[PDB]
Symmetry: C5
Subunit: 165 residues, 5 copies
């Protein structure tokens, strides 16, 4: 095990801010105990799991229903009833503050040709939405013939702290 001097200001700069140069010729095999030392891993797929208690289930027809309206990060997944882009029947996921509204998932998308018999399919969505104070995430159907369906849960608080399942 010997040392050689390094020429690199970036590494030197990086190290300085890390802990307020030379290299070794011997490669050391290691095992990393960091996760165990921290109290156990928080693998993302598990942390975001749906539970009976945490699931915000929704199935909206001819009404407007709030999915969430408290600050934080939310996963939202589901489907809309597709309609002709020329249709008046709206089934959307939207966010609003009572002043403006933005559609995050839109159903009025199909463009049939040569027929008035318009088949419909689910339009999927899978979104991560952050709400601040005064914001509402909602599902809106304006017509008895279309639905907005799915599930949501709060993934983190507004400060970005993860919420256990």
């Amino acid at each position: 095990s010997q040392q050689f001097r390094i020429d690199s200001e970036s590494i030197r700069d990086k190290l300085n801010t890390l802990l307020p140069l030379s290299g070794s010729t011997t490669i050391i095999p290691v095992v990393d105990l960091t996760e165990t030392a921290e109290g156990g891993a928080q693998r993302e797929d598990l942390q975001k799991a749906f539970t009976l208690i945490n699931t915000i289930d929704f199935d909206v027809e001819n009404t407007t229903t709030t999915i969430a309206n408290t600050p934080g990060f939310y996963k939202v997944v589901g489907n809309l009833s597709s309609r002709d882009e020329a249709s008046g029947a709206i089934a959307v996921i939207e966010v609003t503050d009572g002043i403006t509204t933005k559609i995050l998932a839109n159903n009025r998308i199909v463009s049939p040709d040569g027929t008035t018999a318009v088949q419909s399919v689910p339009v999927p969505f899978d979104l991560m939405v952050k709400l601040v104070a005064g914001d509402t995430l909602q599902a809106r159907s304006n017509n008895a013939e279309v639905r907005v369906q799915g599930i949501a849960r709060q993934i983190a608080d507004v400060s970005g702290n993860l919420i256990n399942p």
Copy 2:
């Protein structure tokens, strides 16, 4: 080499990471390493590998006009598959739901299509791909209320209720 470290941040972390049985500096020599952690843990720790389906671990289901339990013991479960789409006004229901016998929540729903100008309603698969955590008393199930619709797919237990990974 060796210099002194001033970090409340690093000091506090190092002491939480490595608790002392009893009531900091840095080196200026960079050490090249190789990491054997994954092998030491038994291999196949990368998420895609660890979550793999096997003949032994696969909970296969294909549900028509009945209710079928996928899991009813605590843990984390991956569940993937399809439902038969129907009109949003149909009586033919195919769902994935979670329940404790008191509250029930649908996680995947088939009643979604909205045809116009026709009574000949075409159907497509409605996919789902879910991670569900069950605690004591919870059931994950597939349910079809009609011989004309199915809920089909596969599931497996990914981890125990405390998050410990289950190796396939």
Copy 3:
């Protein structure tokens, strides 16, 4: 210097990680560079490591037969489509795993439920699976009818012990 550690969890993990038929911490922080990726042959990021090549690709297009995709131990990625049929159809197209005794379907085509019509339109039914085979296991594609197909590609991602196979 060094100091004794009181952590039952850390002690247990270290015992498990580095088994021996036979605990402290340091206060000096060591800067490192990690050569593991190069030592493994490079291109270890998951998207690169799992790439398909002309040589490694198990291509399949199965009609009215059973075709083995893999039958040796390891982890396999398998992706593709089935021909959708009515949920009451006799025309079956599946991905399944079997040991010659038990068989489980991993992807199923018999899913659509038309109403008010006998003219049944069909779409691809996609699948994207990670399957681990052990000794004696076969992953296969099967179509029982000339009208339906199982199409796709697969490759071996790792050996049965989890060691990655580079493309």
Copy 4:
């Protein structure tokens, strides 16, 4: 010291030389347990799924019919997700996502894809897209529909500046 061995690997030697520019490599036979303080020392970056979240303030919402609509035209990284109205491959009705500098244009999501047979009654479905696009100076990301019958619908947001610095949600 625990027993060491000479490592014979040009790739590892060359890599170490580029990493740590001014060797005869050796390896050690003792496995050392470590804990990593890098994240603690660095700042503690936000998990990607959270960092990329859509908000009422940050979302570039679009619903485009018979017009060309800019999604972004300043440098940076943008996530753009949504759907196009499918049409027959021989259709004249175009609904696309495209990037352009005014000299050339590339379609990143194309709607004219279906190939019906045995019928002139052509059903349509959404054609989804989910893209990460980097714009440099002079580039425009846009949604374009050339006809009242087809739409481009979706959302976008700026994920990072052109230097790769992440933007908070």
Copy 5:
């Protein structure tokens, strides 16, 4: 400070660190805190989603009808995403993504997949693909349509060189 009993670990170390002149492995009970400088040493890195972004300059756009069109034919890792025109599995109209070396060819995305029943009016939908392909010397990634009625549409870009070195967007 202690002997390790693990053939799996010993074999792994031996593979990682080759030695022509090739012993008991050992472990230490002293946990060492580290910081990882690798990213800075490599010149810096970008998060994967940003690194893989499409740009006007890097995008290989294709819209293929009744011809064979090369997407890439030099070594490297390529992301390729897009759609094929679906047809009946019994159709003669082919739209595929394939890889070839001029002797062997394999289809990576296939359009002839639908199985209508009780009708000769066969509706078509996009068949999506999203692939990572590694080409070595002599390999070609291509889109092929054998009929004017079917298309292969999409975008691709080179993600890394053949050794895995990442290409900046």
